[PDB]
Amino acid sequence: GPSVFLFPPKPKDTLMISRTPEVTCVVVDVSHEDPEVKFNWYVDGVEVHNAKTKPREEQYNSTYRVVSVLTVLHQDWLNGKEYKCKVSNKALPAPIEKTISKAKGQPREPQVYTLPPSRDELTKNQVSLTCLVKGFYPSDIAVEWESNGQPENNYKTTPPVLDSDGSFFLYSKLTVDKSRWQQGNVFSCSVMHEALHNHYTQKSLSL
């Protein structure tokens, strides 16, 4: 009958103190005869009750989608605590459960590298600025591009791909106008990871 998925915090919500990370328990395909869904949260086997339930919204496919969401702690997500939802419904022989930890593996920090646009690409109307992010574990990460305090826009970032000695890497291409580039503006690649000093580093790129 019902079916349920468990979801981690947004990378960046977990790596900045400013923000507050959440784990989210989605229970799709809830009946409407027996729509009533009850939860139990556990953090490493330890049940916790401070955890809100989101407005119950109707899906238009003859089912309900009811979500529970549970605040977690930056401190103790990155450390490895194992969060576990636990749905029970009348339309359901036994309670279902899944457990969303993070990535079991030593944290390893990412190297960042800013690779200028190729000599052969100054003909084109626009040039590509490159950010090589290499050698991080887990692959949970955030990457952005800025310039002179301003959030440079038309960029695009490959997904993390496993890299042979256990680690992870991605690229991120920023596309600027050949003009801007030759003016000599600096463009920075900004990178957040649990294995960074203060979770943050920023590397620069310019004529």
């Binding site: 790596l15 900045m16 103190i17 959030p151 900004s190 203060n198 943050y200």
Partner: peptide
């Protein structure tokens, strides 16, 4: 001293 992204506190040490 602390890390800032877009002026929003990341993490301090």
């Amino acid at each position: 001293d602390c890390a800032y992204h877009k002026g929003e506190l990341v993490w301090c040490t």
